[PDB]
Every structure is written in structure tokens, then in C-alpha cells.
Scaffold this active site. Structure first.
Site, short mmCIF file in Angstrom:
data_model
loop_
_atom_site.label_atom_id
_atom_site.label_comp_id
_atom_site.label_asym_id
_atom_site.label_seq_id
_atom_site.Cartn_x
_atom_site.Cartn_y
_atom_site.Cartn_z
N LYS A 202 64.61 68.30 29.31
CA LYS A 202 63.60 68.95 30.15
C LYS A 202 63.18 70.28 29.53
CE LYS A 202 61.05 69.50 33.89
NZ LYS A 202 61.88 69.66 35.13
N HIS B 197 57.68 70.35 32.36
CA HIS B 197 57.02 71.18 33.36
C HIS B 197 55.87 71.97 32.67
CE1 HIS B 197 57.01 73.82 37.13
NE2 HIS B 197 56.13 74.35 36.30
N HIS C 18 62.13 62.22 39.01
CA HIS C 18 62.18 63.67 38.96
C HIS C 18 62.86 64.22 40.22
CE1 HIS C 18 59.94 67.52 37.57
NE2 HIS C 18 60.80 67.87 38.51
N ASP D 131 60.28 65.31 42.96
CA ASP D 131 60.52 66.73 42.78
C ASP D 131 61.09 67.34 44.04
OD1 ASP D 131 60.75 68.97 41.13
OD2 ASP D 131 58.71 69.68 41.60
N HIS E 58 55.22 66.03 37.47
CA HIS E 58 54.53 66.52 38.69
C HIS E 58 53.15 67.15 38.47
CE1 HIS E 58 56.19 70.22 37.28
NE2 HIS E 58 57.39 70.08 37.84
N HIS F 194 65.85 67.16 42.04
CA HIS F 194 66.82 68.26 42.07
C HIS F 194 67.89 68.05 43.13
CE1 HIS F 194 64.28 70.64 39.40
NE2 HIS F 194 63.28 70.06 40.05
O1 LIG Z 1 58.82 74.27 43.83
C1 LIG Z 1 59.66 73.86 43.03
N1 LIG Z 1 60.99 74.29 43.04
C2 LIG Z 1 61.93 73.82 42.11
C3 LIG Z 1 63.34 74.33 42.18
O2 LIG Z 1 64.20 73.91 41.36
O3 LIG Z 1 63.51 75.18 43.10
C4 LIG Z 1 61.58 72.90 41.15
C5 LIG Z 1 60.15 72.33 41.16
C6 LIG Z 1 59.56 72.16 39.78
O4 LIG Z 1 58.51 72.77 39.49
O5 LIG Z 1 60.18 71.37 39.10
N2 LIG Z 1 59.23 72.95 42.09
ZN LIG Z 2 58.93 71.43 37.43
ZN LIG Z 3 61.41 69.74 39.29
#
Ligand SMILES: O=C1NC(C(=O)O)=C[C@H](C(=O)O)N1
Ligand SMILES: [Zn+2]
Ligand SMILES: [Zn+2]
Ligand SMILES: O=C1NC(C(=O)O)=C[C@H](C(=O)O)N1
Ligand SMILES: [Zn+2]
Ligand SMILES: [Zn+2]
Lengths: 343, 343
Positions: free
Chosen positions: B99, B136, B13, B247, B174, B15
């Protein structure tokens, strides 16, 4: 168009800071409120008559001419505080009350009280001479979830304390929970409470949904919505041992907006109008004046103010920022529209 | 000093963002992990095979020379997504997974989902072709307390969904609660979960006691200690349908430390050693490799990595910040001494 005339209010829980910040923030208070309970969490804390006397003069030096404002001073309680210093301060008209900060509960509280047993002779003297006790009612043990610290304080500290000192007059400061709301609602004539505007307008969702907002980060921490609803029902009920205490607690912008933001809402500029909105929304404006201007004086055994002010239901925008010599100050509800403003 | 040799891990997971930020943060991932699940939430989101192919190449362009790193692409589920477009991407090895972000009735059909019910054609197609769904798991209604949003999802969406589509493989991304830990633990071979380092290392007190800490602010929100303990217990158990998903979710310092801080921890630099510290503390290093390097590939039906890396128990300092083109990035654990470091 709607005008609302009330007796001049007082603020029964205020942080004025010191130096350049003090100069900047007092006028936002002195221009409206007849009196304020001025909390003693300076660095170093105000724990002596002498300190309090000089601090009160620093406060008066900063009050614009033509504002009729009286700061009501408090003693910062400590484990080693001489009860003779507390009583002397009360008898000379310096100390209106004494403030209990559990050590490390809030800003400038590391010198605070580590237990009730450590300060019994002081508390027994307050009880004797009729000096009220102002309580920051949170436990601080590292293992207790932050959102439980208020409720825990009631069972473990407040209730045993009041059972011991049956004649001690106690203000449960800035209450944030249904737990505290019911405790005070069901208490006797020697128990009162203050409530800030933020704990009435908002819950924790407002601080944490869609972004973290440090300008809503303050202590005790905003709780879940059922708590907020309790507090709003409490003020709306007309219960007469709740009263206005802003807990205005100003910090420079970049002390709020950093990797470890300081706790505190600067709500002095916008508090009275915010309270008016809450009371209006609750169909309880008939109780507004008493909250603002009568209940506090009655608990404290002081006269009500003999002047009046008006609030007008005309939408003002709140300033984005207030200048300081260094950095800016972000008012509570910066950039926002408010429904009620002082005429 | 003690050494932990594991098969090369993967991040299930992640970004990576895009443009200059991508260029800066890729290397922190590609030096360590063989593969990562690359989340689709760009602006605009990755909702086409064409977009995913170009994004993959931009990632690859940014991978430092010598690093054996393969990004595993995902499709952002939307109301307007053609199930044939998703199936084509899966068939072509472009989309590894899809997703699902929280539903919202006001979301543009090009940017998200209004309800699960509205994307059944797509969910039934994934189920048919054996494409995993990454979830999520939060419901985002205004009236639901933020700390409740995960538990409410389980009851309201996750369970009904998995009862509708009994062959759909689902990763509960997560997880942050005992509610989810229990749910996943009591699930079948078609349900798995990822856990972040911050949700193992910390609870909400770390974010809110003694100052507000926006660098610990991320979604889903840090929960009370009992939840953190449930997650630690789950990974420590050897339960094999939980696996590494950082994450890692970077934002420039000025977007984190503002009047309205963005959610997301930049933990790619420190996640692995932080997980190692957690497994050690739980007396469960025997299950560390499986979490990092085995469980995820098993669930996803992909080969386990055949190269190895080593962590050493030598104390090292985490950088205070990391240079961006136009601001800086504050890493997870910035300025702290960490226990395990890659060799
Ligand atoms: O706090 C965060 N911020 C972000 C983001 O893309 O800014 C993604 C995750 C999530 O929940 O996947 N959590
Ligand atoms: Zn998320
Ligand atoms: Zn995420
Ligand atoms: O958030 C705050 N900050 C302060 C302060 O003095 O900075 C005082 C109050 C309080 O807990 O009484 N709450
Ligand atoms: Zn306080
Ligand atoms: Zn205060």
C-alpha cells in the site's frame, strides 16, 4: 509594542440569540462596538414591531453598565409580511433594516422568503421609504452544490432584483466568493457588502484538511482559496462599500460537536483583532479604520462614532471555552494565539 | 420479498485497527466476506513480515467461531523498507499487496514515503515479482485544495508511474472523481479500482447542507454530485476492473464528534446492502455479483468464492451505535431504515 488607535467600530451583521446565551454573548460585543445590526433569526423569528421592541429591551437588560452600546434592530422578512408593519417599524425608529433569508439557507430560516415575487409590495415600500435590504444571498435548491449557492444567487436573484428596484439600497451580507467580490466592486452606490473575519482568514482547506472542524463550519460555506484571496484583495483595496460584519453566530459546544453540527462561528470575542491581522498582512492598515468604523455608517446614513479605541500588537491567548449555564461555548480560534488585542 | 443470491463476497479495502477495536469490528466483516484486504496503517505501521504475521493472528483470534474468513495482509510502503523484506513476505504468502499512502517530504522514513522516486527500488521489485500496488491517490501539498487532491495525483504521480513501470499492476483505491473513473475506464488490464458505498450513495452536499456530518467525513473527501454520478455510471456499466472495497475505517464516537473529527466511515455492517441498493437504483443488478465477488479475484489472480450468500429486500433498522470497551462506534447509516439485508 505597535498600538493602533481607531474610531470605535460597529458590527453590521450580528447574531445575539436570546435568553441565557444572549446574556453570555452581548458583553463580548457591547464592550467594543458602538452599534450592532442585530439579525432577526430567533425562534420564532422577529417579524413584528412589538417583537423587535421587546427583543431590543432584552438586549439592553444584558448590556453591562458603562458600555455605550446601541442594538440596531431588523425585521425578518416573510412571504406574508404586511408592508405597513415594516414601514411602521421604520418610522418609530425600531427597524433599521429588513433581512432577506431565502427559506432554508441558514439557521432559523425555514420561515424565510420563498421568492422575490412573493414580497414585491414589501420591497417596493422599502425602496420608497429608503429602508435598506440585507440579503443572505444563497439559492437553496437541493440540486445545487453547496459551494455554488452564492454565485447562483447573483445571476438568478440579486441582479434581477436590483434591475427591478433601481433605488433599493442593498447590503450583500457575509460575502464569500470572488463572484460576489467583483459584483460588489463593480456595483453602484446602492450596493454594499459585509465580510466576516473567518472568510478572510481561512478557506475550506482549514475546515477539512487533517480533520473536520465544526467550529469553522458556518454559512455561507468557506470556499476555495481563490475566493478568500478575492475577499482579502477587496478589503485591502480601500473600496468603501465594504464594512465590518462578524456574523458572530454562537452555538453550544455539543450542538457544534455532534453528528449534525450547527453552522456558525462565535467570533465576537476575537473578530476585531483578527481583522487587524488581515489588514496588517495585506499592507493595508490605512484602510482598517474605514472598514471598521466609517464605511458602514456612510452606507446606512448614520453618524460615525465619536469615541476611540486602541489595538495593541501583543499576543493574547484565546480562551479554550466560555461557560454557559449548560454546556460551554467554544470561541472562534479557541486556544489559539492572536496577534492583536484591544487595549 | 425479493432475494439476491451471490457468491460469497470479498472486501478489497478494509481497516480492522488493532487491540479492542479489532475485536469489536472483525465480526462485522467475517460473518459476510470470505476475504478482505487488510490495510497496514497501524501505529506503528505494518512494514515487516514479522509484524504482518502477528497482526494476521490477532485478526484470526478475533474471528467468531464458524466464520470462514481469511485476512489478506499488506505492507505499508516506506522510504526505509528493504525490497528483500517485501519480496520475502510476498513469496511467503504473508503480503498479498503493498500500500502506497500519499507522499510527504517531512514524513519519517520509518512511517512513510517522501516521494515515489525515492522508492523505485521497491516499485521495480513489485513489478518484477508481480505484486500488486494499492494506491491512495492524493497529493497532500498544503497549497492544493482538498477537492483537487485526487485529480492532481493522476496527472502528477499515477500516470508518470505507470509509464515508468509498464508491468506493475495497480489498484486505484477508493476513487471519488470522474477524473479517476475516466482514467480507470480508459486504462489497461493492469489498472483497476475500488469504490466505497458512501462515495456511491452520497456527495459533499450530504456532508455539508443543513449541518456538518462528521460520520460522512472520510478521505478522499466526498466530491460534487457530477463525480458521484460518474462513479455510479462506472459500476452500473459492468466494467470489470472495478470491485468492492468498503474502506470501512472506524473511530470511536468521541474521536468523530470532536472539535477536530477523524476521517473514516464505519460501514462494514451496512456496506453490502448499500451497494445492492445502488445497483438496483441504476437498474444494474446483473452486475452486482461481479463487483462484489468476481472482479477483485480476477484482478488479484485468486479463486472466486464457491459458497453463496443471500440478501433479502426486507426493510431493517441500522443500530444507532455499537458498544466498544470504552466508547461507542456509530455505524454508517446509524438509525436508518435500509432496503437490503443479509438473510
Ligand atoms: O477517512 C478515512 N480514514 C482512514 C483511516 O485509516 O482512518 C482511512 C481511509 C483511507 O483514505 O484509506 N479514509
Ligand atoms: Zn486511503
Ligand atoms: Zn483505506
Ligand atoms: O453559520 C451561520 N450561522 C448562522 C446562525 O444564525 O446560526 C447565521 C449565519 C448566516 O448564514 O447568516 N451563518
Ligand atoms: Zn446569512
Ligand atoms: Zn448572519
Amino acid at each position: 509594542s505597535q498600538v493602533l488607535k481607531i474610531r470605535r467600530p460597529d458590527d453590521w451583521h450580528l447574531h445575539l440569540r436570546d435568553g441565557d446565551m444572549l446574556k453570555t454573548v452581548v458583553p463580548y460585543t457591547s464592550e467594543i462596538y458602538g452599534r450592532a445590526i442585530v439579525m432577526p433569526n430567533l425562534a420564532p423569528p422577529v417579524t413584528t414591531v412589538e417583537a423587535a421592541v421587546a427583543y431590543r429591551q432584552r438586549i439592553l437588560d444584558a448590556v453591562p453598565a458603562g458600555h455605550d452600546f446601541t442594538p440596531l434592530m431588523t425585521c425578518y422578512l416573510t412571504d406574508s409580511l404586511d408592508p405597513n408593519e415594516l414601514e411602521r417599524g421604520f418610522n418609530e425608529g425600531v427597524f433599521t433594516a429588513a433581512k432577506l433569508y431565502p427559506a432554508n439557507a441558514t439557521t432559523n430560516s425555514s420561515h424565510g422568503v420563498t421568492s422575490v415575487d412573493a414580497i414585491m409590495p414589501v420591497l417596493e415600500r422599502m425602496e420608497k421609504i429608503g429602508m435598506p435590504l440585507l440579503v443572505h444571498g444563497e439559492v437553496t435548491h437541493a440540486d445545487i452544490d453547496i459551494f455554488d449557492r452564492e454565485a447562483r444567487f447573483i445571476e438568478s436573484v440579486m441582479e434581477p432584483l436590483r434591475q427591478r428596484l433601481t433605488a433599493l439600497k442593498v447590503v450583500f451580507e457575509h460575502i464569500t466568493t470572488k463572484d460576489a467580490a467583483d459584483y460588489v466592486r463593480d456595483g453602484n452606490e446602492r450596493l454594499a457588502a459585509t465580510i466576516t473575519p473567518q472568510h478572510l482568514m481561512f478557506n475550506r482547506n482549514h475546515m477539512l484538511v487533517g480533520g473536520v472542524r465544526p467550529h469553522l463550519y458556518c454559512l455561507p460555506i468557506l470556499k476555495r482559496n481563490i475566493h478568500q484571496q478575492a475577499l482579502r484583495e477587496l478589503v485591502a483595496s480601500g473600496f468603501n462599500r465594504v464594512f465590518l460584519g462578524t456574523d458572530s453566530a454562537p452555538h453550544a459546544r455539543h450542538r457544534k460537536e455532534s453528528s449534525c453540527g450547527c453552522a456558525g462561528c462565535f467570533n465576537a470575542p476575537t473578530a476585531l483583532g483578527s481583522y487587524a491581522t488581515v489588514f496588517e498582512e495585506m499592507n493595508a492598515l490605512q484602510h482598517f479604520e474605514a472598514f471598521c468604523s466609517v464605511n458602514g455608517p456612510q452606507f446606512y446614513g448614520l453618524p460615525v462614532n465619536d469615541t476611540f479605541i486602541e489595538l495593541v500588537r501583543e499576543e493574547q491567548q484565546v480562551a479554550e471555552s466560555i461557560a454557559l449555564t449548560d454546556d460551554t461555548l467554544v470561541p472562534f480560534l479557541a486556544g489559539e494565539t492572536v496577534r492583536w488585542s484591544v487595549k
